[PDB]
Ligand binder design. Structure first.
Ligand code: MG
Length: 385
């Protein structure tokens, strides 16, 4: 029997249809209750010869634990997060559909679902997640995803140990799609709110003291991820960066999410910023302060990462142009979007000039640091300090 597409279509469309019925309800509480009923229905039809395209490995969907889903706000087109149980197979075109079996860290959720699930005992059992957004255009997020993948490939090609975490995007319709969330990480906001610690203090408690391998490793990951996302934010002009859309994983990396405002997305800021990526006192303290080795490493990585990116600029630029041809999104605004993008690769600069540029940009990213208001007055008065 050949792989049929109608089952998959109807599966994807059922997840979308569920959102339309959620949209009829005013409050999260009510949407949540509705969602539980909806997912129960879904399981009548499972297991089936259907898949989550975001898995990136062959598998069949066996179960959607109806109690574990989450509505994410009270908006008219409110997204919802589902957990989806699958059984991995090697060969999908030749594997038959699994037989049915009768009836807050990620790690905890994986544990509780596995124990409640009739399939949880299977060695090929895997839990995936998706956020279904049945009334949002994700083509900009998809563009970002594509650019991030390309930069990752570039940095690997050029042996630059920058670290980012692209997260998978599916564009369904013009104003609908799905996202695989980054699961093994919590927002900085929440890390701070719960622990009531500074990031430095959190690392010292969570990983270890200054002389521990664990601290040094976490610090390295933080620096490598900060540098990666600094270049991402600059090249793509990602806006709206706050502690709610920066996550921290258990290894010490940061992960930026929600690339809503990118490139020429309105509104433009009026504060002469090079980037919306800002390097706070808290961040710098993690890196051992302004004259730390790890801060110097951060600036070296930014230089090498930018050297690498411009060496392969066309690969990045093509992705953007293809998207711009294919559709007219908010992030585009005629020829200038591409022009401005190309200029941010600084093709005309020598490496000495790039290094001076990186010092300037890094200094720029720290403008909001309180010390900077204190010790900047030589630029605003005839005093030399
Ligand atoms: Mg002066």
């Amino acid at each position: 029997e050949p792989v049929r597409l109608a089952p998959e279509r109807e599966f994807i469309k059922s997840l979308m249809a569920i959102g339309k019925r959620l949209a009829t309800l005013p409050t999260k509480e009510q949407k949540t209750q509705r969602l539980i009923s909806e997912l129960s229905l879904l399981n009548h039809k499972l297991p089936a010869r259907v898949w989550l395209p975001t898995a990136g490995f062959d598998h069949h969907v066996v179960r959607v634990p109806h109690t574990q889903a989450v509505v994410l706000n009270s908006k008219d087109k409110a997204p919802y997060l589902i957990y989806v149980e699958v059984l991995e197979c090697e060969n999908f075109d030749t594997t038959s559909v699994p037989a049915r079996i009768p009836e807050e860290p990620w790690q905890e959720k994986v544990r509780r679902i596995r124990e409640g699930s009739p399939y949880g005992h299977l060695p090929n059992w895997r839990l995936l997640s998706v956020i279904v957004k049945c009334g949002d255009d994700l083509r900009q997020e998809l563009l970002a995803f594509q650019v991030l993948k390309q930069l990752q490939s570039i940095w690997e090609q050029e042996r630059v140990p920058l670290w980012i975490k692209p997260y998978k995007i599916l564009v369904i319709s013009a104003d609908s799609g799905m996202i695989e969330p980054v699961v093994n990480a919590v927002s900085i906001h929440q890390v701070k709110k719960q622990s009531q610690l500074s990031l430095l203090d959190y690392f010292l408690q969570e990983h270890g003291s200054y002389t521990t391998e664990a601290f040094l490793s976490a610090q390295r990951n933080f620096v490598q991820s900060c540098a990666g996302y600094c270049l991402v934010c600059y090249l793509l002009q990602v806006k709206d960066r706050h502690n709610g859309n920066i996550l921290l994983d258990a290894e010490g990396h940061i992960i930026h999410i929600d690339f809503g405002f990118i490139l020429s997305s309105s509104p433009r800021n009026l504060g002469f910023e090079t980037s919306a990526f800002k390097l706070t006192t808290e961040f710098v303290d993690v890196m051992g302060g302004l004259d730390g080795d790890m801060f110097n490493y951060y600036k070296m990585l930014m230089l090498q990462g930018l050297i690498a990116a411009r060496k392969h600029m066309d690969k990045v630029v093509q992705i953007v142009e293809i998207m711009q041809q294919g559709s007219q999104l908010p992030c585009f605004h005629g020829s200038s979007t591409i022009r401005n993008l190309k200029e941010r690769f600084h093709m005309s600069m020598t490496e000495e000039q790039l290094q001076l540029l990186v010092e300037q940009m890094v200094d720029g990213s720290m403008r909001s640091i309180t010390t900077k208001l204190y010790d900047g007055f030589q630029y605003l008065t005839n005093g030399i300090m």
